[PDB]
Amino acid sequence: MVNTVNYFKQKLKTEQQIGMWVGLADGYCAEIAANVGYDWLLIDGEHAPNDVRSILAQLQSIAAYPSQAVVRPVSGDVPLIKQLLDIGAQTLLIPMVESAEQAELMVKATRYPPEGIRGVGAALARASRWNNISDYLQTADEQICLLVQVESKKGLDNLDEILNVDGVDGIFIGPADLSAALGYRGNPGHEFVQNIIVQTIQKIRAAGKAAGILSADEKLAKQYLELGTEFVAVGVDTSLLMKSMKQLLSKFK
Amino acid sequence: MVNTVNYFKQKLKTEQQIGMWVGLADGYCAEIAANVGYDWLLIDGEHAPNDVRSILAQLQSIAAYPSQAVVRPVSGDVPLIKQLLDIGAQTLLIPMVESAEQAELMVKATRYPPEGIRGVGAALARASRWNNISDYLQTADEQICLLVQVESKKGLDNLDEILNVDGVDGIFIGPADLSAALGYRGNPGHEFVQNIIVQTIQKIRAAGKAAGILSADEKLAKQYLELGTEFVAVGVDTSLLMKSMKQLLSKFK
Amino acid sequence: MVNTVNYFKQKLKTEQQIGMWVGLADGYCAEIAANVGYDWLLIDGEHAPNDVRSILAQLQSIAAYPSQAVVRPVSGDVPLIKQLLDIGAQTLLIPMVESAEQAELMVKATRYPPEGIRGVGAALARASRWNNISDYLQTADEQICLLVQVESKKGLDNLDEILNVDGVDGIFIGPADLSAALGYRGNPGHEFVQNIIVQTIQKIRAAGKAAGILSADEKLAKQYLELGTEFVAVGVDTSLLMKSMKQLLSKFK
Amino acid sequence: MVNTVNYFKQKLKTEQQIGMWVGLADGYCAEIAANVGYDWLLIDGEHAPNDVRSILAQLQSIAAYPSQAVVRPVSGDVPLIKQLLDIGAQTLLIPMVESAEQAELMVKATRYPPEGIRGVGAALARASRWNNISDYLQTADEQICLLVQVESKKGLDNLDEILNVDGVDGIFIGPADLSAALGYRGNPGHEFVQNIIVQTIQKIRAAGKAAGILSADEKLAKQYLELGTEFVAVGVDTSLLMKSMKQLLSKFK
Amino acid sequence: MVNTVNYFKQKLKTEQQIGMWVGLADGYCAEIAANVGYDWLLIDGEHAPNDVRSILAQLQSIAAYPSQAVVRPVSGDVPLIKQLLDIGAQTLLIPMVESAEQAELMVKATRYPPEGIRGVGAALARASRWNNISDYLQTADEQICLLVQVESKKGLDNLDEILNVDGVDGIFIGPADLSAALGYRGNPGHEFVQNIIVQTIQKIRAAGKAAGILSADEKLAKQYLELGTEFVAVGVDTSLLMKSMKQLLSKFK
Amino acid sequence: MVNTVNYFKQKLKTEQQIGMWVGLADGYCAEIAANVGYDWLLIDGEHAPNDVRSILAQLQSIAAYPSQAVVRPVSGDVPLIKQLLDIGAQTLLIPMVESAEQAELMVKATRYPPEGIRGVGAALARASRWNNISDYLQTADEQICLLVQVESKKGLDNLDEILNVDGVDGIFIGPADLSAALGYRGNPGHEFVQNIIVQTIQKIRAAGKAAGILSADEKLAKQYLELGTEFVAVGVDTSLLMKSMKQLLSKFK
Ligand SMILES: [Ca+2]
Ligand SMILES: [Ca+2]
Ligand SMILES: [Mn+2]
Ligand SMILES: [Mn+2]
Ligand SMILES: [Mn+2]
Ligand SMILES: [Mn+2]
Ligand SMILES: [Mn+2]
Ligand SMILES: [Mn+2]
């Protein structure tokens, strides 16, 4: 077998990819989302009740479908990053990255030694299909994609330094964390926050990195797409399930 | 502790109850549905990948919320009915009921001996809260509700006979199975099917039983409510999740 | 490897075995029970929320301990009996047995062809340790033990006929089901019920079969042991957990 | 989306398909088997500790790979057959089929009304991808494959009658059950059994049906392939895992 | 919907709350505990085999009952604290707190930016009921309760400094860890240990903080309640299950 | 009950123990491996999709068999080590140990206070059988075995210093991580790597510590056994399952 090509990673340079957040934390729900036709699905190990085993079940569900899987670990934890890569996650989204030093550690965490620090266990890994991908250890690094989140004042304070890290493929802006950090918790739509988001997207792209964001606000999402944002998540499964059931009930009260 | 009052069962005589089908087969998804405010939630053990243990998880999730749980077993199987009653399901929906003889057996399956054949194991049952409901074996039968589905030609051929069974609280019409049985598979909206459905609702209510139905078609659901249908399910969680995610993606393609 | 000797089955003829009911339906809780020193543990697939997979987890937990595992299926279902034997349950307790014809079917359901109807799949079975027990298909039948429950009027009406079935190792009396069948639901302690239980134990033993029963009433349990009852379960894990936690709280209200 | 084409079903008429039995009862183990390149994988719900939910996880794992999934239910149970079809199993292997009447019931169990009795719930079914296969109810039946097992004296007594059932796509011979039925339990390699197997294969093919078998004996498997047997399973995951670990240990004792 | 009021947190100032430790690590066992009537239940993620997903199942079980849930994470890990708050735990018990610096970090870990560092993901959180609690991000912090454990010499060496941390609602003494730290492992009952515990309770309360402790010794527990200790756990589910089953067997040996 | 004797730990001084890696991450697969007769089984929490709960299931499966369980946590994380010891793992294998300071911290992480920092919760621990091992807190430390991995340049740079740590029972060489660290990723068989491995084994044994290694290469494994290596793992369950299934298919293509 050849290593699974990371099309998400290639398309960061060629198109704008539309994403759906997957926080229902279940292989069955992940498969439902996989049928819709999103460019990428974000399996959330930070804000949904997921662990390595439940994320593996969702990777296995999604794998039959063209949607690219991206996984968010709970934090930039080197050993957890090792575990998620070995179950076969090819694109990681690291929350709350706040320095070039931390971003560089995340780059190494995703790459085999001697250049990186990713632990080696290809005989045991779905990532290598248990060495049925016979050249995995040679071809793995080329298909790994690292995305880091800037979503704090310290992240913004180190933005130019993070953008100079070779191996950071994309910077994703987190409006919920960033608006709370700025003292506008629950209110990212305020002009003070949105002007910082727009300037941040412009700086990310000017440095030759892919920019990303999540917004369930259709008008904001379309504005970010108009600015050239490369990876835009446009909703969340938990939110769509709740809202669709509420809207239906309201027709009957 | 007092036995949990079956408000669904009482309200069969006092109001029209709006329902949501729960086929996502998971305690987490069942809780999301429980927050919306439906009168009843149908945990589907016939057409969703559920078993006694996954249904128990969903009963435990929903139990903190006012929505009444109804469970559909895969068939009118007496020992499975015993298992579902003991994990604490107070309202059952039996598919494909086709005779007064079968409806009477379902009545007995839901009631303790000597009047019925429900197996006795109150020390072990969530239903009795492990005997923390001190008088459960005396008070249980009063709070159990039996619903049967008419959804075949043979069911329609035995409708008057099923409607004379004491202990059948409600008859639910299944438009998907019934339209297929009538040779209009995938097309319940046809006049030939709808005339049979409307006449069937009228007969159910004339015999003093509650009538029920599921339709994801808003106009049909409102027509059934106008006709006095007592328990109307108006959508399905799997369908709403898929439709909401597809409608969103179509705004961005 | 040698087939696991069924010591429960041997001891039916040599001693009185003390049992604990296991309805917590989990491998971890079963292991806690397995540490205490009961002669037998009853994994309840009738009145606790168990299935083949949860029962397997409990067999694996208990297997490291001398306590003998007995499994109760939800009903006398031939294919389910096949599944339980293959995961390695060596003693079955069949509820609600009501005729010599049904008891004979249960005997055949536990024995390989050509003398019985137990389905053959030794390559896949924990029971054979995946054929690591090299002569399993020759040695299996000798270590299987069948227990049937008499706990209805129809069972009592067929008691002498059930007691003449070769291959029925034991008859277990279910006081909860029997007292409900007799119109004393929740009140097995009534003299009318107890006189029937005592006469039944005497007839079981007169016919050279092992007698069994469950009672959480210490005085009744000791009376049954004084009458020579071979397998007596003396409590239930769910009941002991609830009572122990309630008695403790009552010291502090 | 178009309905998933059942290539296993087509290839019954065009080639000989090599199979692997999947009894490790786990989505992770099923995915390992899916990487090897077998024409078909048999997810065993009869002799491995599987249920609807664990079979669904294995279907989801395998679905990313070319291997065709075949599922064996514990028995020819109409409601269980309904459940397995709705989770998306397109080929079923029914054990212990013993009459043309039973085979005909299995045909109906796999087909929608009005011609069959498969329950209709396409909104809830992975089989329809929750109606994302928009014409599922029209196109489903064409991709369902029914295989029945002949593996008892009564099955052999009704072989010609079973072979005249329209809708039976294949007859699979079970050597373990059949050798035990014939009084050669554990010894299917005896000439008396093998002559009956060879005559049975010849009769199945003469009637224009696909013949199948499992044998872990390479010489027997190759003989069955030389006789034109259309679907031949050549090993079992549990057996290969045990044997590979034992052979390795024996090099070191 | 209104944010769930943290009654445990209010009652720290108005009454003495009786607790039960929940280490059976399962939603079903947690529900049994929830029926008894304890003021609080401690879901142990430090000393019972729990993770975010098993803790979530137990929160869902308990939620239908008045008992207040308190969760103990394995350590004072900021990202794990984030995960536990989002699944909706409103009271945390942090083990092995040893400095005012660590206690201050734990305060911030429980509070939203800009005043704290709790990660923001209300669209995905059971805690906000997936934003069905419309003002969650404004009302969340007020209902969060932080308890820290003093149970080492270094904790005792920093007690006065920990007691001056605003946002520490309570200090819980761990007698097992503390007696081991003091060189009396397995012997907390020694006067040397007890005099330190009593002095510590008095200092906690003198500083206007709630004091807590676990003791399964009824006499010690009642002494702690007479000293005014606000939150006293009086037993452990695993210990009560084992002891209850052993005491019963001893009546029969 | 007496504490389970750690025979693995004793045999480090009296024989050479043959091991199998268990990465199938499931209680059912762990039991299959347990039947073969390996001296030790390595439940891999670093390179297989395991967590505390899935490792517990595997410890419970294996516990009925003489094979000694060794657990590898994802990293030298003190609170995770606490969790693994309490579910009853008596031998740990810590990856990527790089200093005497880190090895000393791992020694303390495995021993109760006051000498170590292992958290005390014996009422809740499978390790104490919930205190059914009456003197566990006095007898525990004697049966715990600590193994550390040297598998980086920094580990080799600190080898003499790690070998002088009292409480390190064994040093295990990781050829996959070490060959990658040395710039021969996927090529441990190179003379440059093998000379370092052989010299490292000689130094480990000269310092009076047990030496260990994993090699799926039969010749290398036998060379390591000839050199006196005390604990040699000779294969991996995932690799054997894949290889056995591929070798079989190649006989039929
Ligand atoms: Ca199940
Ligand atoms: Ca987990
Ligand atoms: Mn964020
Ligand atoms: Mn229907
Ligand atoms: Mn009974
Ligand atoms: Mn067979
Ligand atoms: Mn403690
Ligand atoms: Mn390594």
Neighbours of F200 (CB within 10 A): 19
Please state, in angstroms and rounded to a whole number, the distance separating the CA atoms of residues F167 and F169.
6
Facing residues of C92 across strands?
A: C71, C146
Say if residues E125 and E88 touch (Cβ distance below 8 Å).
Answer: yes
Which residue is it, tokens 């410890």?
F59
Q: If DSSP codes are grouped into helix, strand and coil, which group holds residue A16? A: coil
Angle C63-C125-F45 from CA coordinates, rounded to 5°: 60
Inter-helix orientation angle A78-86/A100-109, to 10°: 40
Angle A161-A163-A168 from CA coordinates, rounded to 5°: 120
Please state, in angstroms and rounded to a whole number, the distance separating the CA atoms of residues C32 and C238.
13
Centre of ligand 4 to C-alpha B175, Å, is 7
The encoded tokens of residue A66 equal: 């063209």
The encoded tokens of residue B60 equal: 């435990």
Which residue is it, tokens 């200090």?
E171
- Is the bond preceding residue F66 a cis peptide, omega within 30 degrees? no
CA-wise closest residue to D150 among D195, D187, D191, D95: D95
Residues whose CB falls within 8 Å of the CB of residue D151, separated by 6 or more in sequence, listed in order:
D95, D96, D173, D174, D175, D176, D177, D178, D181
Please state, in angstroms and rounded to a whole number, the distance separating the CA atoms of residues D117 and D106.
9
CA-wise closest residue to A61 among D147, E20, B154, D88: D88
Q: Dihedral sign, CA of C197, C200, C204, C206? A: positive
In which region does residue F137 sit, left (phi positive, over 0), alpha (psi from -120 to 50) or beta (all else)?
Answer: alpha
Cβ of residue B52 closer than 8 Å to a chain E Cβ: no
H helix runs in B135-236, sequence order: 136-139, 153-157, 159-163, 175-181, 191-206, 218-226
Report how far apart the first and last C-alpha atoms of chain B are (Å, whole number).
Answer: 55
Please state, in angstroms and rounded to a whole number, the distance separating the CA atoms of residues C74 and C86.
17
Angle D32-D33-D38 from CA coordinates, rounded to 5°: 145
Centre of ligand 2 to C-alpha C28, Å, is 15
Neighbours of E40 (CB within 10 A): 23
Q: Which residues of A touch E53 (CB under 8 A)?
A: 25, 49-51, 54
Please state, in angstroms and rounded to a whole number, the distance separating the CA atoms of residues C122 and C120.
6
Facing residues of C212 across strands?
A: C172, C231
**E211-247 exposure pattern, b = at least 16 Cβ within 10 A, e = fewer:** bbbbbbeeebbebbbeeebbbbbbbbbbbbbbbbbee
Pairing of strands A170-173, A210-214: parallel
Cross-chain residue pair F27–C60, CB shorter than 8 Å: yes
Q: Which residue from A37, A49, A240 is facing B241, i.e. has the nearest CB? A: A240
The encoded tokens of residue D25 equal: 């009862």
Which phi and psi (to 5°) does residue E251 adopt?
-75, -15
**Per-residue DSSP letter, D145:** E
The encoded tokens of residue A87 equal: 């179950």
Which phi and psi (to 5°) does residue E110 adopt?
-100, 0
Cross-chain residue pair D1–A129, CB shorter than 8 Å: no
Chains C/B: 3 or more C-beta pairs closer than 8 A? yes
Please state, in angstroms and rounded to a whole number, the distance separating the CA atoms of residues C46 and C70.
13
The encoded tokens of residue E215 equal: 């003791």
Neighbours of E142 (CB within 10 A): 10
- Active-site residue identified among C6, C32, C47, C100: C47
Identify from B222, B223, B248, B251 which residue to disrupt to test chain A contact, counting A C-beta atoms within 10 A and taking the largest count: B248
* Total number of residues shown for chain C: 253
Residues whose CB falls within 8 Å of the CB of residue B28, separated by 6 or more in sequence, listed in order:
A24, A25, A26, A49, B61, E56, E126
Query: What are the C-alpha distances in Å from A103 to residues A204, B148, C76, F96, F213?
Result: 14, 61, 62, 22, 34
Q: If DSSP codes are grouped into helix, strand and coil, which group holds residue E146? A: strand
Say if residues F127 and F86 touch (Cβ distance below 8 Å).
Answer: yes
| Chain D residue with minimum CA distance to F219 | D251
CA-wise closest residue to F150 among F230, F221, F204: F204
Alpha-carbon radius of gyration of chain B: 18
Pairing of strands C17-22, B17-22: unpaired
Say if residues F33 and F240 touch (Cβ distance below 8 Å).
Answer: no
Please state, in angstroms and rounded to a whole number, the distance separating the CA atoms of residues F174 and F235.
13
CA-wise closest residue to F125 among E25, C34, E173, E59: E25
Identify from B4, B61, B68 which residue to disrupt to test chain E contact, counting E C-beta atoms within 10 A and taking the largest count: B61
Cβ of residue E186 closer than 8 Å to a chain F Cβ: yes
Please state, in angstroms and rounded to a whole number, the distance separating the CA atoms of residues E171 and E211.
5
Identify from D80, D108, D120, D135 which residue to disrupt to test chain B contact, counting B C-beta atoms within 10 A and taking the largest count: D120
Please state, in angstroms and rounded to a whole number, the distance separating the CA atoms of residues F227 and D175.
49
Which class for C11: exposed (0-12), middle (13-18), buried (19 or more C-beta within 10 A)? middle
Please state, in angstroms and rounded to a whole number, the distance separating the CA atoms of residues B250 and B242.
12
Angle F101-F103-F109 from CA coordinates, rounded to 5°: 105
H helix runs in E25-133, sequence order: 27-34, 52-62, 78-86, 100-109
Centre of ligand 6 to C-alpha D23, Å, is 13
Cβ of residue F35 closer than 8 Å to a chain D Cβ: yes
CA-wise closest residue to C221 among C37, C18, C1, C46: C18
Neighbours, chain E (3 or more CB pairs < 8 A): A, B, C, F
Facing residues of C149 across strands?
A: C172
Which residue is it, tokens 């880190």?
F102
* Total number of residues shown for chain B: 253
Chains F/B: 3 or more C-beta pairs closer than 8 A? no
Query: What are the C-alpha distances in Å from D175 to residues A183, C181, D232, F110, F122?
Result: 73, 45, 12, 53, 52
* Type of residue numbered D249: L
Residues whose CB falls within 8 Å of the CB of residue F52, separated by 6 or more in sequence, listed in order:
E49, E50, E51, F80, F83, F84, F87
- The beta strands (E) that lie in C136-230 are given as 145-150, 170-173, 210-214
Please state, in angstroms and rounded to a whole number, the distance separating the CA atoms of residues E7 and C112.
61
Please state, in angstroms and rounded to a whole number, the distance separating the CA atoms of residues F68 and F91.
9
Please state, in angstroms and rounded to a whole number, the distance separating the CA atoms of residues D127 and D133.
9
CA-wise closest residue to E50 among E70, E8, E31, E22: E22
3-state secondary structure string across A93-117 = EECCCCCHHHHHHHHHHCCCCCCCC
Residues with CB under 5 A from ligand 7 (ion): E 151, 174, 177
Residues whose CB falls within 8 Å of the CB of residue D174, separated by 6 or more in sequence, listed in order:
C120, D95, D149, D150, D151, D214
Neighbours of C83 (CB within 10 A): 28
3-state secondary structure string across E63-74 = CCCCCEEEEECC
Q: If DSSP codes are grouped into helix, strand and coil, which group holds residue C14? A: coil
Please state, in angstroms and rounded to a whole number, the distance separating the CA atoms of residues C67 and C84.
18
Say if residues C173 and C93 touch (Cβ distance below 8 Å).
Answer: no
Inter-helix orientation angle A52-62/A27-34, to 10°: 30
**Per-residue DSSP letter, F81:** H
How many Cα atoms occupy the beta-carbon half-sphere of B57 within 13 Å? 22
Which residue is it, tokens 């799997």?
B238
Query: What are the C-alpha distances in Å from B234 to residues B32, B40, C195, E131, E143?
Result: 17, 11, 55, 23, 36
Please state, in angstroms and rounded to a whole number, the distance separating the CA atoms of residues F59 and F83.
13
Pairing of strands F17-22, E231-236: unpaired
The encoded tokens of residue D7 equal: 């290539």
| Chain E residue with minimum CA distance to C216 | E248
Tell me, rounded to whole angstroms, the distance of Cα C133 from its chain centroid.
Answer: 25
Please state, in angstroms and rounded to a whole number, the distance separating the CA atoms of residues B100 and B97.
8
- The ranges assigned to domains in chain F are 1-253
Please state, in angstroms and rounded to a whole number, the distance separating the CA atoms of residues E33 and D182.
55
Facing residues of E20 across strands?
A: E41
**Per-residue DSSP letter, F142:** G
Say if residues D145 and D169 touch (Cβ distance below 8 Å).
Answer: yes
| Chain D residue with minimum CA distance to C117 | D181
Which phi and psi (to 5°) does residue B118 adopt?
-60, 125
Task: Tell me the structure's resolution in angstroms, rounded to a single decimal.
Answer: 1.9
Tell me, rounded to whole angstroms, the distance of Cα D173 from its chain centroid.
Answer: 11
> What string of DSSP letters covers D40-102?
EEEEESSSSS--HHHHHHHHHHHTTSSSEEEEE-SS--HHHHHHHHHTT--EEEES----HHH
* Type of residue numbered B146: L
The encoded tokens of residue C16 equal: 């009185």
Which bound ligand lies closest to the C-alpha atom of F42?
8
CA-wise closest residue to F44 among F140, F172, F152: F172
Facing residues of C17 across strands?
A: C231
Please state, in angstroms and rounded to a whole number, the distance separating the CA atoms of residues C124 and D66.
25
Cβ of residue F74 closer than 8 Å to a chain A Cβ: yes
Query: What are the C-alpha distances in Å from C166 to residues A19, C89, C200, C208?
Result: 67, 21, 18, 11
Say if residues D186 and C138 touch (Cβ distance below 8 Å).
Answer: yes
Angle C133-C134-C138 from CA coordinates, rounded to 5°: 95
Q: Which residue from C32, C37, C253 is facing E238, i.e. has the nearest CB? A: C32
Say if residues D72 and D98 touch (Cβ distance below 8 Å).
Answer: no
Query: What are the C-alpha distances in Å from B18 to residues A201, A252, B69, E246?
Result: 46, 7, 12, 50
Method by which the coordinates were obtained: X-ray
**Per-residue DSSP letter, D142:** G
Cβ of residue A2 closer than 8 Å to a chain D Cβ: no
- Name the CA dihedral angle for E101, E106, E111, E117, rounded to a multiple of 10 degrees: 70
Which residue is it, tokens 């969530």?
B126
| Chain A residue with minimum CA distance to D4 | A64
Which class for D66: exposed (0-12), middle (13-18), buried (19 or more C-beta within 10 A)? exposed
* Type of residue numbered A174: G
Please state, in angstroms and rounded to a whole number, the distance separating the CA atoms of residues D190 and D195.
9
Query: What are the C-alpha distances in Å from A221 to residues A36, A216, B248?
Result: 19, 7, 11
Q: Which residues of F touch C4 (CB under 8 A)?
A: none
Please state, in angstroms and rounded to a whole number, the distance separating the CA atoms of residues A63 and B150.
40
Q: Which residues of E touch C252 (CB under 8 A)?
A: 18, 221-222, 225, 232, 234
Please state, in angstroms and rounded to a whole number, the distance separating the CA atoms of residues E49 and F53.
6
Cross-chain residue pair D114–B185, CB shorter than 8 Å: yes
